[PDB]
Amino acid sequence: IDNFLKIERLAENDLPKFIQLIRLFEAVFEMKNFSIPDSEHLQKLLNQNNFYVFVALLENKIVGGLTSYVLEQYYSEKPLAYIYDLAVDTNWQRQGIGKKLITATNQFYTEKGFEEVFVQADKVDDYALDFYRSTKPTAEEQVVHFYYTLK
């Protein structure tokens, strides 16, 4: 596939590819009764200087991607990147696409002089864990994630 596959970092004139990726997230994550935000909101997000999206393309079809947030640090002038979502179309999994997305993401942030990139996976998702373990991370740590649903 590495003759056909293209990895692309989205820019501000890439809203259609971004929407395609959000729809892939909806599909792969099996999100229920999802209503996509209006395009104006999604464009503002894409225009943020702390947000970077990477996609995998076959021809003009988005077949995978990931989203990431920049966290400027107070411990270092070298920022963190937080990978928020990563998905590959079920029809194109096990073809190296996820690994290529992680590699491209980390290379980009390396060139930008970042300290570290990190990502979260659920402890019961053994295949996600297998995947991230195969990308040669520096460290892996058990974490408890808490949230507060606001009124």
Ligand X SMILES: OC[C@H]1O[C@H](O[C@H]2O[C@H](CO)[C@@H](O)[C@H](O)[C@H]2O)[C@H](O)[C@@H](O)[C@@H]1O
Rounded Cα distance, 55 and 100, in Å: 10
Q: Which is nearer to ligand X, 108 or 131 (CB)?
A: 131
| Structure-token pair, residue 87 | 């998905």
**Contact of 89 with 28, CB cutoff 8 Å:** yes
120 near ligand X, judged by CB under 6 A: yes
**Identity (one letter) of the amino acid at 6?**
K
Q: Is 47 annotated as a binding residue?
A: yes
Quickly tell me which residue has 């970042």 as its tokens.
114
Q: Is 141 annotated as a binding residue?
A: no
Q: Report the C-alpha gap between 72 and 62 in whole angstroms.
A: 29
Among 12, 84, 90, 110, binds ligand X (CB under 6 A): 84
> What element of type H or E holds 83?
strand 80-88
Contact with Ca ion (CB under 5 A): which of 16, 31, 34, 47?
47
**Using CA atoms, how far apart are residues 48 and 52, in angstroms rounded to an integer?**
8
Choose one: 1-9, 57-65, 71-79, 93-101; the region binding a second copy (CB under 8 A).
71-79
Q: Is 14 annotated as a binding residue?
A: yes
On whether 88 is known to bind a ligand per the annotation, the reply is yes
Residues 6+ apart with CB under 8 A from 36: 19, 22, 23, 26, 42
71 binds ligand X (CB under 6 A): no
Question: Taking CB under 5 A as the rule, which mask of x and - marks residues 85-124 in contact with Ca ion?
Answer: ----------------------------------------
Among 9, 16, 27, 34, interactor with a second copy by CB under 8 A: 34
Closest to Ca ion by CB, 3 vs 60, is: 60
